[PDB]
Design a binder for this molecule. Structure first.
Ligand SMILES: C[C@@]1(c2nc(NC(=O)c3ncc(C(F)(F)F)cc3Cl)ccc2F)CO[C@@](C)(C(F)(F)F)C(N)=N1
Length: 378
């Protein structure tokens, strides 16, 4: 039941949200990062200083070796391993056991994070971006094929350092959001690719050709902390946020995410910072809806006992050369429905949210733009 799935996610702020899973027979319990930005189920399978436990294939009678290596290098770090299949279950997910592909990580460099409490990654995106290639069926594809679970999942990421949330597999739990769910089409089934049609900072349009917001794609990624923007959009956004917050001046390093800004505990001047709205393409021509975030979402607290006389924050909007990434900055405080069956992503205000007494994060619409331009970059 969905009620049994509520609060099945845990994590440390900015370290990743994870769900408990079991692999093998007899079952081995592991904490697994929920990642909508990748498509491999990859688990630590050898000792590592940052791993409390790991997958021991020799203890699983149901393990099957696929006799195929896999090497996956990312911008920061890389993982090498071996492919196989085994029985997998989600103790606080659907009441089912399925056979799924598993990449057993045997060597890695700067992939596992100290103190993150996760031992692998559940890539929830599509086969097109699976490694080594699209013939390696992702976990959610196997789950849907082998069971009667509907082809949809939803995430309620709720932003001390400990975080929580819910991953609801096979449905939408109405207790997790308020107001209406607004849907944007999935443009291509690879990443969860979407289209942004307008960006406003404190109600002021950035006034760019909308293709700039999607250069070269825009994705929804629970495996990325920041709201990451293409260079041109990022520079305009920083200029606009600086203009709104000009009563206080911060080091250049802050706007580049290289330095923290600190205030005496409880004194953060939230009202000098603007709201940011991303307008997403609707399901109907030239209609859109907006997602509006507050500074409590894009100025992320950095927990550190040593600086705890203050509240210290990192600016969580950053530049990208690979397109827009709607990471946790966007997802936390919203209930996000990955409706794979209908090729669409829904957004609603979450039951767990940031609102202070002046402003509230929102999901609202509809908005019309009679300008007929397609905002898709490719
Ligand atoms: C597979 C890959 C990947 N992701 C992570 N993620 C995290 O550790 C992480 N996750 C969520 C959050 C929070 F919840 F706070 F947002 C904070 C963190 Cl710090 C770690 C290793 C790794 F290889 C590739 O890199 C990206 C980012 C890719 F570049 F592909 F986008 C991705 N999506 N998945």
């Amino acid at each position: 039941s969905f009620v049994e799935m509520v609060d099945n996610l845990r994590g440390k702020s900015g370290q990743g949200y994870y769900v408990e899973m079991t692999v093998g027979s007899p079952p081995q319990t592991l904490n697994i990062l929920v990642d909508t930005g990748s498509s491999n189920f990859a688990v630590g399978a050898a000792p590592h200083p940052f791993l409390h436990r790991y997958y021991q294939r020799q203890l699983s009678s149901t393990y099957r070796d696929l006799r195929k290596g896999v090497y996956v290098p990312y911008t920061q770090g890389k993982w090498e391993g071996e492919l196989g299949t085994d029985l997998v279950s989600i103790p606080h997910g659907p009441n089912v056991t399925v056979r799924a592909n598993i990449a057993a990580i045997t060597e890695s460099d700067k992939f596992f994070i100290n103190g993150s409490n996760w031992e692998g990654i559940l890539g929830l995106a599509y086969a097109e971006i699976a490694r080594p290639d699209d013939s390696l069926e992702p976990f959610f594809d196997s789950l849907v094929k082998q069971t009667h679970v509907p082809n949809l999942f939803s995430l309620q990421l709720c932003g001390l350092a400990s975080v929580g949330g819910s991953m609801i597999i096979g449905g939408i739990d109405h207790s997790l959001y308020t107001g209406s769910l607004w849907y944007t089409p999935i443009r291509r089934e690879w990443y969860y690719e979407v289209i942004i049609v307008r960006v406003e900072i404190n109600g002021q349009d950035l006034k760019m050709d909308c293709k700039e917001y999607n250069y070269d794609k825009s994705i929804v990624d629970s495996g990325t902390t920041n709201l990451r923007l293409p260079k041109k959009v990022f520079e305009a956004a920083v200029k606009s946020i600086k203009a709104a917050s000009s009563t206080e001046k911060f080091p250049d390093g802050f706007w580049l995410g290289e330095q923290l800004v600190c205030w005496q505990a409880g004194t953060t001047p939230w009202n000098i910072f603007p709201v940011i709205s991303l307008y997403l393409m609707g399901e109907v021509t030239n209609q859109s809806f907006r997602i509006t975030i507050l500074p409590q979402q894009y100025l992320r607290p950095v927990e550190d006992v040593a600086t705890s006389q203050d509240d210290c924050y990192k600016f969580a909007i950053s530049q990208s050369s690979t397109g827009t990434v709607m990471g946790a900055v966007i997802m936390e405080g919203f209930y996000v429905v990955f409706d794979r069956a209908r090729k669409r992503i829904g957004f609603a205000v979450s039951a767990c949210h940031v609102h202070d007494e002046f402003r509230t994060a929102a999901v609202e619409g509809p908005f019309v733009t009679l300008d007929m331009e397609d905002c898709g970059y490719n």
